[PDB]
Design a protein around this motif. Structure first.
Motif, short mmCIF file in Angstrom:
data_model
loop_
_atom_site.label_atom_id
_atom_site.label_comp_id
_atom_site.label_asym_id
_atom_site.label_seq_id
_atom_site.Cartn_x
_atom_site.Cartn_y
_atom_site.Cartn_z
N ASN B 1 0.77 -1.25 0.00
CA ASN B 1 0.00 0.00 0.00
C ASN B 1 0.80 1.29 0.00
OD1 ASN B 1 -3.18 0.02 0.24
ND2 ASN B 1 -2.55 -1.81 1.39
N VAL B 2 1.95 1.27 0.68
CA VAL B 2 2.67 2.47 1.16
C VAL B 2 1.98 2.92 2.46
CG1 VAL B 2 3.35 4.89 0.71
CG2 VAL B 2 3.60 3.16 -1.11
N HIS B 3 2.55 2.49 3.59
CA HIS B 3 1.86 2.50 4.90
C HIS B 3 0.59 1.64 4.84
CE1 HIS B 3 4.00 5.36 7.71
NE2 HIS B 3 4.63 5.61 6.58
N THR B 4 -0.23 1.68 5.89
CA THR B 4 -1.44 0.84 5.93
C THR B 4 -2.72 1.64 6.23
OG1 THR B 4 -0.65 0.09 8.13
CG2 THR B 4 -0.29 -1.39 6.36
N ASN B 5 -2.88 2.77 5.54
CA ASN B 5 -4.00 3.68 5.78
C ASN B 5 -5.28 3.39 4.96
OD1 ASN B 5 -3.58 6.40 3.57
ND2 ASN B 5 -2.03 4.78 3.75
N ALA B 6 -5.17 2.50 3.97
CA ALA B 6 -6.33 2.11 3.16
C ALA B 6 -7.08 0.90 3.76
CB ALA B 6 -5.91 1.83 1.73
N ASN B 7 -6.47 0.30 4.78
CA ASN B 7 -6.93 -0.97 5.34
C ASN B 7 -8.25 -0.90 6.10
OD1 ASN B 7 -3.71 -2.64 6.03
ND2 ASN B 7 -4.71 -2.01 4.12
N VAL B 8 -9.20 -1.73 5.67
CA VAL B 8 -10.52 -1.81 6.31
C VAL B 8 -10.50 -2.85 7.42
CG1 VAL B 8 -12.99 -2.34 5.95
CG2 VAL B 8 -11.72 -1.05 4.19
N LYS B 9 -10.87 -2.42 8.63
CA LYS B 9 -10.94 -3.28 9.81
C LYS B 9 -12.35 -3.85 9.98
CE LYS B 9 -6.93 -1.50 10.29
NZ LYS B 9 -6.76 -0.05 10.64
N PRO B 10 -12.44 -5.11 10.41
CA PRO B 10 -13.73 -5.72 10.75
C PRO B 10 -14.34 -5.06 11.98
CG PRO B 10 -11.92 -7.11 11.46
CD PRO B 10 -11.32 -6.05 10.60
N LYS B 11 -15.67 -5.09 12.09
CA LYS B 11 -16.33 -4.53 13.27
C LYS B 11 -16.29 -5.52 14.42
CE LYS B 11 -17.36 -0.45 11.76
NZ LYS B 11 -16.89 0.80 12.41
N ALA B 12 -15.93 -5.02 15.60
CA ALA B 12 -15.93 -5.83 16.82
C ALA B 12 -17.35 -6.25 17.15
CB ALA B 12 -15.32 -5.04 17.97
N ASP B 13 -17.54 -7.55 17.39
CA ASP B 13 -18.83 -8.05 17.86
C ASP B 13 -19.02 -7.63 19.32
OD1 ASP B 13 -21.30 -9.28 17.93
OD2 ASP B 13 -20.61 -11.32 17.88
N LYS B 14 -20.04 -6.80 19.55
CA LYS B 14 -20.21 -6.12 20.84
C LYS B 14 -20.53 -7.02 22.03
CE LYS B 14 -21.12 -1.38 19.36
NZ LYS B 14 -20.16 -1.46 18.23
N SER B 15 -21.23 -8.13 21.79
CA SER B 15 -21.58 -9.08 22.86
C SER B 15 -20.59 -10.25 23.00
CB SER B 15 -23.03 -9.57 22.70
OG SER B 15 -23.38 -9.75 21.34
N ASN B 16 -19.30 -9.95 22.79
CA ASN B 16 -18.21 -10.90 23.01
C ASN B 16 -17.06 -10.26 23.79
OD1 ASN B 16 -19.33 -13.25 21.76
ND2 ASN B 16 -18.80 -12.41 19.74
N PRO B 17 -16.80 -10.74 25.00
CA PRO B 17 -15.81 -10.13 25.89
C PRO B 17 -14.38 -10.24 25.37
CG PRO B 17 -17.26 -11.66 27.08
CD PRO B 17 -17.43 -11.93 25.62
N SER B 18 -14.14 -11.18 24.46
CA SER B 18 -12.85 -11.32 23.78
C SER B 18 -12.52 -10.11 22.89
CB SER B 18 -12.83 -12.61 22.95
OG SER B 18 -12.73 -13.75 23.78
N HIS B 19 -13.55 -9.58 22.24
CA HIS B 19 -13.40 -8.48 21.29
C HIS B 19 -13.37 -7.13 21.99
CE1 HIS B 19 -14.55 -11.84 18.74
NE2 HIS B 19 -14.26 -11.13 17.67
N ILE B 20 -12.31 -6.35 21.74
CA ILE B 20 -12.22 -4.95 22.17
C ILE B 20 -12.44 -4.05 20.96
CG2 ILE B 20 -10.84 -3.21 23.42
CD1 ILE B 20 -9.14 -5.49 24.55
N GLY B 21 -13.40 -3.13 21.06
CA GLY B 21 -13.72 -2.22 19.97
C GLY B 21 -13.23 -0.80 20.18
N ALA B 22 -13.00 -0.09 19.07
CA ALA B 22 -12.67 1.32 19.10
C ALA B 22 -13.87 2.13 19.59
CB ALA B 22 -12.23 1.80 17.72
N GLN B 23 -13.62 3.00 20.56
CA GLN B 23 -14.66 3.77 21.23
C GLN B 23 -14.91 5.10 20.50
OE1 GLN B 23 -11.21 4.19 22.71
NE2 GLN B 23 -11.35 2.02 22.13
#
Lengths: 90, 86
Positions: B1-23
């Motif tokens: 890419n040239v850095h990693t600014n185009a990268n699409v992240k998956p959405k954190a599943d909210k009802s799973n304590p393993s997953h931490i999401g961006a606030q």
């Protein structure tokens, strides 16, 4: 049409002739093929690409998870409120 | 890419304590943990910059980091998966 032939009484008996089709007018009893699943993809497809009337076109916003409290049908069915009152006394 | 600014992240599943999401929408200023690490409860595992302001993301419990979805200087959106722990 083929389903109609298969389902038809004269066909299943095994006794049928080349006349079978013409002598059975109800084989062309064909309702328009209801198609719910595809239509729903069209809508989502449309709103995703072209947006919704006076809703600020943007990424689907992050929504906080909702805990929807539930009560059993039976429990509701045992309840006697103002509706039952109405049916009771008028 | 040239850095990693185009990268699409998956959405954190909210009802799973393993997953931490961006606030909040932020920028990853400093990555502090890698895949396969174990640190105590409250471990500072990720440093974001919201808008000129900086907060460390902490682990809710003890456990092992299964995945880190981001790299240094990466943009994030609300509800974006960042970390998974056990």
């Amino acid at each position: 049409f083929l389903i109609n032939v298969m389902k038809n009484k004269k066909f299943t008996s095994g006794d049928y002739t080349t006349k079978f089709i013409e002598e059975t007018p109800e084989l062309f009893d064909i309702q328009p093929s209801l198609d719910r699943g595809t239509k729903t993809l069209e809508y989502i497809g449309n709103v995703t690409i072209n947006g919704f009337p006076n809703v600020e076109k943007r990424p689907k916003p992050d929504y906080e998870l909702a805990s929807i409290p539930t009560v059993s049908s039976s429990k509701i069915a045992s309840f006697s409120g103002t509706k039952q009152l109405l049916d009771e006394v008028g | 890419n040239v850095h990693t600014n185009a990268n699409v992240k998956p959405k954190a599943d909210k009802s799973n304590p393993s997953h931490i999401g961006a606030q909040m929408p932020g920028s990853v200023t400093e990555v502090k943990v890698s895949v396969g690490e174990t640190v105590k409860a409250n471990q500072p595992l990720l440093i974001t910059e919201a808008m000129k302001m900086e907060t460390t993301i902490q682990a809710p419990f003890d456990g092992v980091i299964k995945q880190v979805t981001v790299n240094n200087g990466d943009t994030i959106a609300t509800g974006d998966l960042l970390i998974e722990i056990e």
